[PDB]
Amino acid sequence: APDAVAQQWAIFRAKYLRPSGRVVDTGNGGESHSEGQGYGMLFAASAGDLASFQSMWMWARTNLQHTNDKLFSWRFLKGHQPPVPDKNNATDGDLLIALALGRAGKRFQRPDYIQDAMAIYGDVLNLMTMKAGPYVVLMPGAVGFTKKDSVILNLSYYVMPSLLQAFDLTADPRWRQVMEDGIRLVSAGRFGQWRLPPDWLAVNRATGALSIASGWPPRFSYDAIRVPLYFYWAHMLAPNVLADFTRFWNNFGANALPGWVDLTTGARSPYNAPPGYLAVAECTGLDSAGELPTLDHAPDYYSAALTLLVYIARAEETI
Numbered sequence: 361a362p363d364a365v366a367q368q369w370a371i372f373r374a375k376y377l378r379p380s381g382r383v384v385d386t387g388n389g390g391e392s393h394s395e396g397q398g399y400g401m402l403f404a405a406s407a408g409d410l411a412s413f414q415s416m417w418m419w420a421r422t423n424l425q426h427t428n429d430k431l432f433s434w435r436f437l438k439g440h441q442p443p444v445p446d447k448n449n450a451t452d453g454d455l456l457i458a459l460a461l462g463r464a465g466k467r468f469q470r471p472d473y474i475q476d477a478m479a480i481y482g483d484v485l486n487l488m489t490m491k492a493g494p495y496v497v498l499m500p501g502a503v504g505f506t507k508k509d510s511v512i513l514n515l516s517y518y519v520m521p522s523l524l525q526a527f528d529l530t531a532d533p534r535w536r537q538v539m540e541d542g543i544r545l546v547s548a549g550r551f552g553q554w555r556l557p558p559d560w561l562a563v564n565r566a567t568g569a570l571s572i573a574s575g576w577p578p579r580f581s582y583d584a585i586r587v588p589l590y591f592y593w594a595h596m597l598a599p600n601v602l603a604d605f606t607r608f609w610n611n612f613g614a615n616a617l618p619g620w621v622d623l624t625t626g627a628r629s630p631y632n633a634p635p636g637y638l639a640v641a642e643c644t645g646l647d648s649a650g651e652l653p654t655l656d657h658a659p660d661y662y663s664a665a666l667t668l669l670v671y672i673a674r675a676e677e678t679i
Contacts, residue, residue, distance in 0.1 A: 365675050368668050369407035371655035375664065376400070377412060381419030382436070385661050390439060394424055394432040394449065398456025399665045405464035406672045413464050417473075420457060429487060430479045432457065434501070448503045452517040454484050459522035462529055474529065481526040485534055493568015495541040496534070512573050513561045515549065516586040518542040520594030521676065543596055545570070546587060552623035554611070555604040556580035557587045572623055581620035581629075585637050585666070588644040593673035597644070606645025614638055614648060634659055636666025643670055643677075 361367075376384050377400060385396035397420040404413040424432040424444065431449040458480035465473030488499045492511045498518055499505050505512040523542070527535040549561045549570045559581050560573035572578040588605045591597040597605075612618065617637050618628035635653035642648045652671065658664035 365403070365668075365671050366407040366409075368655050368671050369403045369409060371658075372400070372403055372664055372668055373409070373412055375655075376661060377416070379415075381415035381417075382423075382438075383416065385665070387660070390437065392423075392436040392438070394420070394434050394453025395456060396665075397424065397432075398453050398460060399669065401460035402456055402463065402672060403668050405460050405467055406675065408467065410464075410468050413460070413468075417457075417461070417464075417476075421476075430483045431487065431502075448501050450517070451484065451488050451498060451500050452514070452519055454480055454488075455517070455519040455522040458484070459519060459525055462522075462525045477525070478529050481530055482532075485526070485530075485532060485538070489534065489538050492563040492565050495545065495563065495568065496537045497541060497545070497563065498538060509566070510562045510564045512575070513545070513563060514559065514583055515542075515546060515557045515561055516559070516583040516590070518546075518587075518590060520590035520596060521673075524594055539596075543591075543598065546591060547598060547601060550601075550604070551578075552580075552621070553626050554580075554608045554621060556608065556621060556623060557584050558623055559583040577620075577622070578624045579620045579622055582662070585633075585640055586669075589640045589670060589673055592644050593677050595677065602645060605641075609641040609644070609646040614641075614646065617641060634663035634666070636663040636670070639667045639670035643674060 378384060382392045383396035383400040385393055397416055401413055401416050423436055431454045433444045433447045434450040434453060435446060436443050458477045461473045461477035464470060465477060489496055497513050500514040500517050523535060523539050546557060550557050551572055557580060558572045559579060560576045562571045562573040617633040619631055619633040620629045639652050642650055642652060653667050655664045655667060658667060
């Protein structure tokens with residue numbers, strides 16, 4: 361359905377976009393994040409909604425963008441004295457906002473948006489990519505992910521289509537190894553009986569050995585679910601990796617996908633995944649018709665955003 365993205369965006373907008381331009385990505389509505397603005401902007405650009413895009417970008421630039429670099433503080437707390445007390449960034453948020461701006465710049469013939477995207481990409485590349493073992497990796501944020509012996513990565517922050525757009529808009533050769541090593545990390549950084557990537561990956565700085573990061577439950581869950589999606593979208597999901605995801609989805613079927621799987625024991629969540637996981641599975645191997653879940657049935661923001669992200673991927677990946 362050519363207008364499917366616009367229809368789902370209409371639902372998302374109705375539920376989560378405030379007139380201020382802030383996307384409410386939490387239950388009570390007192391929080392907003394760089395990821396939420398990025399997703400919303402991407403969805404509005406994809407749906408051709410310039411008015412909403414303008415509102416959300418102006419809100420993100422004024423309330424979250426840094427002054428000494430072009431990255432974004434990760435969280436906004438309405439009502440809190442400093443509304444943005446933690447200036448640390450979340451790299452996927454930076455990359456989603458830049459992706460949205462490059463898309464909006466082309467769709468709406470707005471050269472300033474193209475410049476805005478390039479300015480963010482320049483800082484993601486300089487400030488968030490560095491060496492770990494034999495790879496050049498993308499760090500999840502400025503603070504908290506580099507330890508003495510290793511670096512922590514979040515593979516789901518490799519917003520694939522955005523890395524491709526960065527190279528297309530900046531022509532910086534450094535993006536090449538970043539993307540190529542991302543492919544290598546997804547291939548090698550998987551664990552357990554289902555060979556799944558973890559939400560958080562540790563890379564020994566000296567040896568480059570890959571392991572499941574120790575500071576979070578050792579699971580494939582709410583972040584890692586985006587890995588197969590972003591690589592499918594970018595036409596960079598290797599056959600052996602797609603094969604493993606396909607086996608995994610089909611082990612469960614559409615009515616029993618897990619919200620998380622422990623990669624050390626094989627245990628699963630004592631509940632089923634939100635519909636957004638089903639949307640991802642349908643694009644990456646699950647035996648199905650392809651009739652994606654719709655947002656009017658979304659149980660919460662998380663599921664709605666992930667589901668709409670799949671509609672965007674499908675609209676773009678299929679050429």
